[PDB]
């Protein structure tokens, strides 16, 4: 059962997230009147879907050394390339998700003053800058992604730090800070400030429309922040736990691989959060179908 449960979990996430991401990309393309004209939210939502699609297309090339026999079949050159590509897609999607929340903060808390710089040209430059920053953040990943000779005749792709006794700490902490801790603080801070400033002072709170507006946005801000936390906290909690762990046990291995799947499930759940919690997108999608 262990050899069938784990491949099915990754396969279900990979297929389900590909369907969702391809649906978001296709729908945003079909609704374009003029390219780069008053579609700043659409630029972020289609770039986040491209990276999420990349993060799932490259997933089977990274997990095939975990299910079958624990053997890397692509050689040392592809091991560096695939590991760097996989790590880049995780960091890029997290940065675009963080930037998509700062964009929503500016579109709400500063609705007048942000029209001067919330241009589609500026949005494209920001996203292209996120890829450049993501490449810098994965530099230690591909500088040390080498083959590891395991006991027996099997080898596997992995990280070969120059000083694994001491360099294991900064490698884990810097990825934890840049990819989980810092983005979650910004994403959480942005959405709570939106909920505190999502209505003008002149708006009548007694009216059902204003109360209903806050109710729907509140459950959308919770879902966005919670999905990111649930899908990445177990991955980075076990990541910090294994610093003290020297000889892992079977239960830890099962939990670690389950946590890896949840991280990939974040790219599977991001498109559907936008599909379900956006009435305009959801209604338009139903019309096509």
């Amino acid at each position: 059962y262990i050899n069938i449960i784990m491949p099915s979990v990754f396969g279900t996430i990979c297929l389900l997230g590909i369907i969702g991401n391809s649906t978001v990309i296709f729908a945003v393309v079909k609704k374009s009147k003029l390219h780069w004209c008053n579609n700043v939210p659409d630029i972020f939502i289609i770039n986040l879907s491209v990276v999420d699609l990349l993060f799932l297309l490259g997933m089977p090339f990274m997990i095939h050394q975990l299910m079958g026999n624990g053997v890397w079949h692509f050689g040392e050159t592809m091991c560096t390339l695939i590991t760097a590509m996989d790590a880049n897609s995780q960091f890029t999607s997290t940065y675009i998700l963080t930037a998509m929340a700062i964009d929503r903060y500016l579109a709400t808390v500063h609705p007048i003053s942000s029209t001067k710089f919330r241009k589609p040209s500026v949005a494209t430059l920001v996203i292209c800058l996120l890829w450049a920053l993501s490449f810098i953040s994965i530099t230690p990943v591909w500088l040390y992604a080498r083959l590891i000779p395991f006991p027996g005749g099997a080898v596997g792709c992995g990280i070969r730090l120059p000083n694994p006794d001491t360099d294991l700490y900064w490698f884990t902490l810097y990825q934890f800070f840049l990819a989980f801790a810092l983005p979650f603080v910004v994403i959480t801070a942005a959405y709570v400030r939106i909920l505190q400033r999502m209505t003008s002072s002149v708006a009548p709170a007694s009216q059902r429309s204003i109360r209903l507006r806050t109710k729907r946005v509140t459950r959308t801000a919770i879902a966005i922040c919670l999905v990111f936390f649930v899908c990445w906290a177990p991955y980075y909690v076990l990541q910090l736990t294994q610093l003290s762990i020297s000889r892992p046990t079977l239960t830890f291995v099962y939990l670690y691989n389950a946590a890896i799947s949840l991280g990939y499930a974040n790219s599977c759940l991001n498109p559907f959060v936008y599909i379900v919690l956006c009435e305009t997108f959801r209604k338009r999608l139903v019309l096509s179908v």
Binding site: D86, G158, L168, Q242, P248, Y256
Partner: peptide, 17 residues
């Protein structure tokens, strides 16, 4: 079907210490 007690670092393995 293998000995799945290898140490991990991220989504890739690491040599145990």
């Amino acid at each position: 079907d293998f000995d799945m007690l290898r140490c991990m670092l991220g989504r890739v393995y690491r040599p145990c210490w």
